Paper text:
Single crystal X-ray diffraction was used to assess whether the CNGRC peptide induces a preferred conformation of the N-terminus of hTNF in the NGR-hTNF molecule. The 2.65 Å crystal structure of NGR-hTNF is substantially identical to that observed in the absence of the N-terminal extension, with a rmsd of 0.81 Å for 373 Cα and 0.95 Å for 2701 total atoms in the trimeric arrangement. The N-terminal region of the mature hTNFα (amino acids 1–8) and the CNGRCG hexapeptide could not be traced due to the lack of a significant continuous electron density in the difference maps. These findings indicate that the N-terminus of the NGR-hTNF molecule does not interact stably with the cytokine, is endowed with very high flexibility and can thus attain many possible orientations. Hence, the crystal structure of NGR-hTNF demonstrates that the targeting peptide in NGR-hTNF does not stabilize a different, specific conformation of the cytokine, and remains available for the interaction with accessory receptors such as CD13. This study superimposed the newly determined structure of NGR-hTNF onto the crystal structure of the lymphotoxin α-TNFR1 complex to model a possible geometry of interaction. In this model, the N-terminal region of NGR-hTNF is positioned between the three TNFR1 molecules, allowing the preceding peptide to extend in the solvent and thus interact with other receptors. These findings suggest that the N-terminal fusion peptide does not hinder the interactions with the TNFR1, and could be available for binding to specific molecular determinants on the cell surface, thus modulating the TNF activity. Taken together, these results demonstrate that the addition of the CNGRC peptide at the N-terminal does not modify the interaction of hTNF with immobilized TNFR1 and TNFR2. These results are consistent with the determined NGR-hTNF structure showing that the N-terminal region is flexible and does not modify the hTNF structure.
The recombinant cytokine NGR-TNF, carrying the CNGRC tumor homing peptide, has shown a higher anti-tumor activity than the corresponding wild type cytokine in animal models, thus allowing its use at low, not toxic concentrations. This enhanced efficacy is due to the CNGRC motif that, through the binding to an isoform of the aminopeptidase N (also called CD13), selectively expressed by angiogenic vessels, increases the delivery of the tagged cytokine at the tumor site. Despite the large body of evidence supporting the vascular targeting properties of the NGR-hTNF and its vascular and antitumor effects, a structural and biochemical characterization of the interaction between the recombinant cytokine and its receptors, TNFR and CD13, is still lacking.
Numbering used by the authors:
A (entry chain A): 9 to 157
B (entry chain C): 9 to 31, 36 to 105, 111 to 157
C (entry chain B): 9 to 107, 110 to 157
Amino acid sequence: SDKPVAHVVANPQAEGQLQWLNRRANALLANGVELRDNQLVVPSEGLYLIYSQVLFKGQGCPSTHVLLTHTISRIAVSYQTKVNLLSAIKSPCQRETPEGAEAKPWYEPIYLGGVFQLEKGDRLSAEINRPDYLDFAESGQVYFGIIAL
Amino acid sequence: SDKPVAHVVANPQAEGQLQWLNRLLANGVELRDNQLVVPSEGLYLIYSQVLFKGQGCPSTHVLLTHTISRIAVSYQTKVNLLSAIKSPCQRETAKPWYEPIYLGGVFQLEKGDRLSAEINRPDYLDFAESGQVYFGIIAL
Amino acid sequence: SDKPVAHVVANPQAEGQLQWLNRRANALLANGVELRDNQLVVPSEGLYLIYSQVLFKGQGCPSTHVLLTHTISRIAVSYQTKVNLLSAIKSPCQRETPEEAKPWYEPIYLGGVFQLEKGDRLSAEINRPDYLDFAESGQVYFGIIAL
């Protein structure tokens, strides 16, 4: 109660895309924070803890080299441009699975978190490059949240 | 002080289980049945880290899971709040492998809610780096 | 805005070392927190959220086994002793790539709440600075905030 806060989760029913839902159990979106165009809107200036987690899953390793990225960006009203705040890269595959050997699943989580000075009207986005590898099987694996401290 | 807070660490002497010791734990938060009990409603930052370690890669595929669950007073049943999966071995071999998992998020908790932080492979836990397998909350 | 806070990022121009800068772009260091000797100084006692991230990168796997560590330590004023707060280990390479080397990425994120004293100094260190990746700001960071 009181402080601006949000904790949104990926829509498990949206295949191959990262769509944040707020209307779920153990999810938050109150005290001015809005979810518009898949982005969190800051209702007032202050110091905010921003964090997100994504979980990637793939069946075996393909011929091409896979890079998984997760990025939290800020779109300021003053600029109206996307600026990266937190990002990370992961590479699940060192070799393509030998032809004839069984394809084994791989899992790669990425967590991002930090405190930033935000202005009223700033929009925050948490995006990945490979939504086709996203894993929604279990609740609590893909989430995105902020809170004014 | 003031607000409920807890920071418990894994018992390195507990074989085949993830057992939290009763050493931060103040301002109403209790540790009973290996679970943190919420003393009052409010917004809580929940976080946990586990460290997995193995001396090699087996023929079969190993899945490491870490999960923070909630047992709400209103909805009394185990519900996932934060969870993650890792696969340490892509190919069969002996060289050691290391896998950390960190979880963190803000949630609205009610008085009497019980929080658990659990793993599936306690035999792969790493206690070399004492104090690195932990589970904590703090009301914001 | 009231609370002691810091969010510093790695210097991209410092080769082979982890040097924290207090920048003009989304980096914080206000309300008493100081950056001295590449170390964050706590201005007042309380519970602090501490977190850091590093990103390691290598252009293949070497003959020896690589262990990547990231560690947040505390240096108390009264003791001046080093206490480990947060650490993690990762192993990017299972076998040395036999002679087409492909790049690998391994990030390490740390986070926890700790009771800190006025004047305590916090350090965020790695063991393999030669594998550090600075291309994109916001991939190597270190921050605290009193809760």
